[PDB]
Design a protein around this ligand. Structure first.
Ligand SMILES: COc1ccc2c(CC(=O)O)coc2c1
Ligand SMILES: COc1ccc2c(CC(=O)O)coc2c1
Ligand SMILES: COc1ccc2c(CC(=O)O)coc2c1
Ligand SMILES: COc1ccc2c(CC(=O)O)coc2c1
Lengths: 343, 343
């Protein structure tokens, strides 16, 4: 609802964003050919998703700021900082698809997979990260929260990177070692690699634009938000194997890709030498036969039930956190998000 | 000399830099395994070079700042911002070696080429870029020039990226098209891809730490510095084919790698349909026979002489620029650099 009647103005602001990131640079015809390429990279990797992160910035902005302080200017910046979050993600995904050796993303071909692009996508991903800061300068240069956003995005980039390193160390491409797929490692990965930039960064940004820069306040928001992030990912791994493609719009391949899914992490705890022997035998196989075997071992261990139980507790805990750390923020800011992820 | 008696204190400060970038992070054992990896990336890609860029920061610092304002603290930061420049480069080189499909660098194996690293080097390069800003916060958080350096490094990163895009567009891996190897394109590449972060960034940084943030002043420094950068690269391409490995310490392969060298750009201007037919036939070949043929066509066109002539003019022009835009800066700052590149 609140997101539905915002997407319009949001996705429409992308044309300005692109225009700015190119027309101004055209003051130097020498790099005109590069700027042309830059436009292709943006119109292909930025556009496409549901913009839930980018919009969270816009949505949270309206709530945190007084109705009469949301003039044209303030909204223009908000939509910009909103797209910056979206660009940061584009940067992460473009680069991750190369490392993981992915074929598709959002059903379409991965940028580096297109003919003529290849590994040059590495530079393209870096350009995307660069645009973030060019925008912060073109729109918030004079704002009192300018240095806060620059440091926010930088910090988020770092956290996601450290997280990405952990994941790589945990599941080496060519090392089906389910031994290091602990629950403790799973949470550390989700926190740094997903939770931080997916839930905290969007809100944190909005807060700074609203003048809420108090460390303690951000310390409470981050507390709530990282819990939602942790649930979001666990629901994502679950749905990937027990979900319905016609609804989720995605085809699960976690077992095949030999990922450190939440399921397999649980499957390893509640398991006996006989259970493990089987799992350690059909995990990471491209056989429609061996995959169905792992799924069976999950159902057999009541993992689906373990999920529901976790979801139930989770929702309670989040609400408990919200009833205590929401203030001075409007509970609606966190309630709206919870009602977005707890499908 | 001035560089010789600085390298000692510089390279010695690297242990602190690493220590800081890891011990402080150890406050979170969860990411300890990543931080361990981060240390390997740093001790392998940061160390090794001659640190001419990093040192320029330290050297220029001493000159621009009053002898009594160079206490322990000021030097500690200077060496840090010095290493940040060095880290920015490490980030560019690690990533460029992957894109170009290089085998070696500084005579040693390219980071992504080591067993177990591979494309994960993409994330490693990003971490290196991240450390830059973690250092600026750990050392200059409270400095009055903090936002200036953050924006300097960001800007330099952007410029180098745009430049990198141009180079990729100019010499597509699988397109021996000497048609777009113009002199105009060559200069645009060198400017953005090399000149900016190699000569301007090191000095610009030192200037900001010295309080010299005046736009006009930086506008003059950049003017001089980008000219030296342009000569530096042209001397680098020259030396690559007509230099002496026992002295330069490098084995030239520009003709083979089918690069947009300064030589070949000149070779194309002063050429007749017969000259071009030959060049367009032996450029980019791994044959010790075809390579020697291109070299001959260069000598035959008096290119070596064209270089010397260019060097002569260059030195004059730079000195002319220095005698006019050096102030308020001490000419010694630019004279020291010129005497470093004009071998
Ligand atoms: C921060 O709010 C969010 C973040 C992510 C999501 C998603 C998944 C996605 O589209 O990536 C659905 O609702 C969200 C809401
Ligand atoms: C895991 O099982 C459940 C069952 C009910 C719920 C609810 C109630 C609601 O907010 O609509 C939230 O998460 C749930 C999870
Ligand atoms: C900014 O001053 C410089 C920059 C680069 C260099 C080099 C080449 C290198 O070591 O990369 C020699 O002297 C320099 C001096
Ligand atoms: C290209 O031929 C030359 C010859 C002499 C020189 C000098 C004189 C000096 O500063 O030592 C600088 O660059 C030169 C280039």
């Amino acid at each position: 609802d609140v997101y539905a009647q915002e997407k319009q103005d949001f996705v429409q602001h992308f044309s300005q964003i692109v225009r700015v990131l190119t027309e101004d640079e055209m003051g130097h015809p020498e790099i005109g050919d590069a700027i042309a390429r830059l436009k292709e990279v943006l119109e292909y990797n930025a556009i496409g998703g549901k913009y839930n992160r980018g919009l969270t910035v816009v949505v949270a902005f309206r709530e945190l700021v007084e109705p009469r302080k949301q003039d044209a200017d303030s909204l223009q910046r908000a939509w910009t900082v909103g797209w910056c979050v979206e660009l940061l993600q584009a940067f992460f995904l473009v680069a991750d698809d190369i490392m993981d050796s992915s074929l598709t993303r959002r059903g379409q071909i991965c940028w580096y997979q297109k003919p003529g692009v290849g590994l040059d996508a590495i530079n393209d991903a870096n350009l995307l990260e660069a645009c973030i800061y060019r925008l912060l300068k073109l729109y918030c240069r004079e704002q009192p929260y300018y240095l806060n956003l620059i440091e926010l995005f930088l910090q988020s980039s770092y956290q996601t990177e450290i997280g990405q390193t952990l994941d790589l160390l945990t599941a080496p491409q060519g090392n089906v070692d389910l031994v290091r797929f602990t629950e403790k490692r799973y949470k550390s990965i989700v926190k740094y690699k997903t939770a931080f930039y997916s839930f905290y960064l969007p809100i944190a940004a909005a807060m700074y634009m609203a003048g809420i820069d108090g460390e303690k306040e951000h310390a409470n928001a981050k507390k709530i938000l990282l819990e939602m992030g942790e649930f979001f990912q666990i629901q994502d791994d679950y749905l990937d194997l027990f979900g319905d493609p016609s609804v989720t719009g995605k085809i699960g391949t976690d077992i095949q890709d030999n990922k450190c899914s939440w399921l397999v992490v649980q499957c390893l705890q509640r398991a006996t030498p006989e259970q493990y022997q089987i799992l350690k035998e059909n995990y990471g196989q491209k056989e429609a036969e061996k995959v169905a075997r792992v799924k069976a071992l999950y159902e057999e261990l009541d993992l689906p039930a373990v999920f529901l139980q976790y979801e139930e507790d989770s929702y309670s805990h989040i609400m408990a956190l919200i009833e205590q750390y929401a203030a001075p923020l409007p509970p609606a800011v966190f309630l709206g998000l919870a009602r977005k992820i707890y499908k």
